[PDB]
Design an enzyme around this catalytic site. Structure first.
Site, PDB file in Angstrom:
ATOM      1  N   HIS A  47     -27.608   3.537  25.213  1.00  0.00           N
ATOM      2  CA  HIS A  47     -28.557   2.440  25.133  1.00  0.00           C
ATOM      3  C   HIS A  47     -28.083   1.291  26.009  1.00  0.00           C
ATOM      4  O   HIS A  47     -28.855   0.714  26.765  1.00  0.00           O
ATOM      5  CB  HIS A  47     -28.679   1.945  23.692  1.00  0.00           C
ATOM      6  CG  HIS A  47     -29.662   0.831  23.523  1.00  0.00           C
ATOM      7  ND1 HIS A  47     -29.384  -0.298  22.784  1.00  0.00           N
ATOM      8  CD2 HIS A  47     -30.934   0.690  23.966  1.00  0.00           C
ATOM      9  CE1 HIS A  47     -30.446  -1.085  22.776  1.00  0.00           C
ATOM     10  NE2 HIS A  47     -31.400  -0.509  23.484  1.00  0.00           N
ATOM     11  N   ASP A  89     -35.036   1.136  24.383  1.00  0.00           N
ATOM     12  CA  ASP A  89     -35.025   0.882  22.952  1.00  0.00           C
ATOM     13  C   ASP A  89     -35.623   2.044  22.180  1.00  0.00           C
ATOM     14  O   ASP A  89     -35.092   2.452  21.152  1.00  0.00           O
ATOM     15  CB  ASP A  89     -35.791  -0.407  22.648  1.00  0.00           C
ATOM     16  CG  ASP A  89     -35.129  -1.631  23.262  1.00  0.00           C
ATOM     17  OD1 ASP A  89     -33.920  -1.554  23.564  1.00  0.00           O
ATOM     18  OD2 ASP A  89     -35.806  -2.666  23.427  1.00  0.00           O
TER      19      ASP A  89
END
Lengths: 121, 121
Positions: A47, A89
């Site tokens: 991420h 996300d």
């Protein structure tokens, strides 16, 4: 921003974003990256790398759009950066969910327990 | 860093920082966002704002000197940023203590996703 990300984590994992991933391992949190403790940790690692590649938009404060229709995150059209931010996300929320099986509360922390270096993303 | 902040908070409020504030309301802890829910949350909101003015240092990892002298937090790093950082932490610690009267454990692990937008700082 943290609003989208946080809502996504909740939607995908059902867990309190800050509580289970605000401070978790070496990559889930606001403390940078580190050698993934476990599959949940690796999700956050990727991420953060996903953020790195971004160009122009602030992953922390840029607010973007996304739909939750049919309980799946559909990133809004947006613009390149925003769309890529949203996908970052979305990707982590999903990965987080997919790895709930090995989620280990013991990796939750007050202060990051010092972590090994993380591969140059 | 979180170490100084955590100790300040413990010292000022007499409660475990992490447990009571690590994830309190909309502004306390792992990057809390949005409009404060109450005075305590407002403290954290103000704190996060205070952090924005910091030039040259990182609240996350930058350690700093401060002393607890007659039960008073006394910032010591004459280094401008670190001193300011220290004053941010001191201020939130005092603010939390001061609003302990309205501390709401129902917010102790507030679902930040429920948080509305926050005014700029």
């Amino acid at each position: 921003s943290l609003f989208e990300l946080g809502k996504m984590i909740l939607q995908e994992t059902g867990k309190n974003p800050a509580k289970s991933y605000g401070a978790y391992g070496c990559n889930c949190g606001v403390l940078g990256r580190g050698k993934p403790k476990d599959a949940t940790d690796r999700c956050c690692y990727v991420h953060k790398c996903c953020y790195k590649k971004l160009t122009g938009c602030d992953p922390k404060k840029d607010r973007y759009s996304y739909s939750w229709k049919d309980k799946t995150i559909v990133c809004g059209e947006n613009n390149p950066c925003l769309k890529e931010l949203c996908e970052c996300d979305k990707a982590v929320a999903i990965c987080l969910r997919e790895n709930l099986g090995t989620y280990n509360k013991k990796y939750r922390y007050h202060l990051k327990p010092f972590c090994k270096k993380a591969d140059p993303c």
